[PDB]
Amino acid sequence: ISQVEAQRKILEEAVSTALELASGKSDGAEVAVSKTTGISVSTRYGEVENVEFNSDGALGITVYHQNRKGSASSTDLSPQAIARTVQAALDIARYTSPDPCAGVADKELLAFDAPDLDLFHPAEVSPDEAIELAARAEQAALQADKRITNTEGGSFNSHYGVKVFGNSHGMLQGYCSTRHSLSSCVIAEENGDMERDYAYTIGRAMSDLQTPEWVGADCARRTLSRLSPRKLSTMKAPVIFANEVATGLFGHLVGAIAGGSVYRKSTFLLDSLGKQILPDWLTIEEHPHLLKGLASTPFDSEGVRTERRDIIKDGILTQWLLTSYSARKLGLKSTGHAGGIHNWRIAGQGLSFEQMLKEMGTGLVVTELMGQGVSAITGDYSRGAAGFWVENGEIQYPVSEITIAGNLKDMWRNIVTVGNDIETRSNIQCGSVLLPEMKIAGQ
Amino acid sequence: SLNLVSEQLLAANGLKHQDLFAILGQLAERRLDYGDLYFQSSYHESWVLEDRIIKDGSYNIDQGVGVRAISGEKTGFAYADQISLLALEQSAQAARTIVRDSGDGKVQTLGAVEHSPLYTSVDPLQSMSREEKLDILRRVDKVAREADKRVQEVTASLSGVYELILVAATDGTLAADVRPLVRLSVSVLVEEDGKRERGASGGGGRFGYEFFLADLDGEVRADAWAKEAVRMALVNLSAVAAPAGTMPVVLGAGWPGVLLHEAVGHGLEGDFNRRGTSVFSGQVGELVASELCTVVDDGTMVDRRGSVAIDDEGTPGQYNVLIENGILKGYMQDKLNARLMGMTPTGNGRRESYAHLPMPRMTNTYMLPGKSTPQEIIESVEYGIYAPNFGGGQVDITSDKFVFSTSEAYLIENGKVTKPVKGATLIGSGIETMQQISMVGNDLKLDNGVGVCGKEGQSLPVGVGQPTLKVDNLTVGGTA
Amino acid sequence: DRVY
Ligand code: NA
Ligand code: NA
Ligand SMILES: [Zn+2]
What we know:
The complex is a heterotrimer.
Chain A lengths: L1 H22 L4 E17 L2 E19 L2 E7 L4 H15 L33 H16 L5 E20 L4 E19 L2 E11 L8 H14 L9 E7 L1 H14 L2 H5 L20 E3 L22 E5 L2 E2 L6 H7 L13 E2 L7 H8 L2 E8 L9 E12 L2 E14 H6 L3 E2 L9 E2 L3 E9 L2
Parallel strand pairs in A: 7-12, 11-16
Antiparallel strand pairs in A: 1-2, 1-4, 2-3, 4-5, 5-6, 7-17, 8-9, 8-11, 9-10, 12-13, 13-14, 14-17, 15-17
Helix pairs in contact in A: 1-2, 3-4
Chain B lengths: L1 H8 L7 H11 L6 E17 L2 E19 L2 E7 L4 H11 L28 H4 L2 H18 L3 E19 L4 E19 L2 E11 L9 E2 L2 E2 H18 L5 E8 L6 H8 L4 H6 L19 E4 L20 E6 L2 E2 L6 H6 L8 E2 L8 E2 L3 E4 L6 H6 L3 E14 L4 E13 L2 E6 L3 E5 H6 L1 E4 L4 E2 L4 E5 L2 E9 L2 E9 L3
Parallel strand pairs in B: 9-16, 15-23
Antiparallel strand pairs in B: 1-2, 1-4, 2-3, 4-5, 5-6, 7-8, 9-24, 10-11, 10-15, 11-12, 13-14, 16-17, 17-18, 17-19, 19-24, 20-24, 21-23, 22-23
Chain C lengths: L4
The complex binds sodium ion (2 copies) and zinc ion.
């Protein structure tokens, strides 16, 4: 923490300088600064490919006067650059129109004394040490099977950051964090067909990562499993979203219950507050204060406290995800969701992935999705898919060049079960999800 | 122009030509094929109208230097968010550690050459008054709302960027660009009997905001686009379930050229082909598309969003024929991949900023026109889809599977466009889909200036285009 | 990474 504590002092001082410069000319102001430092390396066939040294800084300010707002940003944190940034935002706010829902977050909601969530676990990893980790992962994948005929490389990333937020109610709080990750991606071939897949490990501390050999083995297993797929014929069938894409299935809920969509009437869940939109046994728990959590945060991007909440409780939508502005539009208070969600947890209902395959019997497992294809305002869903066909409760062959289609309201309401095979590397964490039917387009 | 950029990026930051020599010399202490210094400064402004008011505005500044050291496959890279001698020294000293071995030190003398100008050097942010910029947004709001009583909400935004770049390299390259970019975006919400839908329009290019007030087929462009967003929203509001399965699809001209961007364009980027990870690797001279198809990547188009007067390596933008009468001709390159493939730069070495590595990337990717009329194409289909507008797409270049998702689509029944259908993701294999193109229209156009391309986390402005065309069999992700 |  020598270099990091020096950066942190510089950042705290930049926030205080920006706020003081703004204070005589605005009714309110918000300032955010960050610094991120680290290394990104790659390997090809076990040899160093790229070595990138990362060093990024940023200052952003929003000012308010007469309910008019203006924003400016700079990557230069010199006193003169900060002065120019503050002036630029002030100048904008002379010309924007009054909008009473704009402004600094309510003082009563601010994290003046923010909790320490233990997000910072630095490692002095040299470029050569990083390269060897990446090479180990890639090599382990490449040696798994003679059908692995090419590579997209090994990769290792290690970064530390400092974030400081302040506003004109007198909040000034900052925190440090780290993220480390290790991955590999290889290519297999059979009968003129090439496939690519990847594996990874991620964590806040280096000692929370899987081994390079684990990553390689998982990369090879996934890649080889894709070989010689079939294009299904057009049909209706049950669908399991494997854990890795099931998280994203729940992820569509975020936009659907975002306060900005709700006040603008641009969500298909506009009339669903307090209604049962998911099965009555399904609860989505938000845990912003988990120690070392991948998406834990001591305050949101407006400085607002984050809270333990059940967003969905026994299938019922309990709240919107609000920021200061959208809360004000709705006559409510911010829920601390400026900048997004903060660790969602969905418990399994007892079945393993294997048991879920047996329960389904015949149907599609989706493991990868492509395209956007989700309408925020209607819930209509149409995405490209790859995965596996299942018959007799057993995987028969990989599939690809197909789509799955339906509507999120129906999809979510009629979930059959959620598996105990929880994906633990993401913000939203859940197991695989069984839907009773989708329209599969293919041949 | 180089002189003007040099004054702003070098002289104003206490740097001279001889400092470039020193820093390149620091790199060339190691055994390298190439090294470069990349200087950038940029200014971005935005204004947003929503709820009938000028709700928001921003002004964002960035500047920096990026330094690369390259040996064969290998790149060492470091950068700083400031332009100074110390930033350059620190960045070079880090980057060069990619190779321990000493080099001969023999760099090529720096020397600039002329290139064709593709866009103004007049700063778009200062060339129009603030109230005149905001009047573009006000006019969009008024016109959209007047177009139909069902219009309930309008969000209209203006964005502008002014960017200076200079690049100096061990191969003697010394080059600079002045890059303006503006965009007008419009989004509308319609409501009828409790049902709501949205529609969008917009565009721009490399020029000032006056473009948005210029004539487009007898009306003010901004007005035309305001009306288009409403039209799109109303079509969507009326749309019924799309059909599911394999059927003929007729694609409109312009932005439906996303097809080409996904089906061939990434697959023909030289990094994937050098590595052998693209389906197109080793296929030069082979039929990869129907004989009706000639696909180009063209960095030379005056005033266009996707164009590159120089790329980020200082290579002037080029007209590159990728596929000619169905036959694969070659790949888009950056310097690194061109060397490893025994080929030459093509003007496709692009980076998001000084803080990111360049790689082979698209500019404006389009299909040349053919002999069919759009009417003849539609009349050839007994049952299928007509899709004149799209959202985005995605591609797996190894397995050769791609998708793109409609934003406006209709049934074709008995050779006539009929009912509007809901958004659907279309999926195919790239090569196989290109080989299914049986009719190519005489109505080429490019997109309006809306393209963003993503690769390795780096977003870039791009163009796409095509005439109306027919794909005989494509999988449609409807529900019906 | 994904490719758009
Ligand atoms: Na004040
Ligand atoms: Na020229
Ligand atoms: Zn792209």
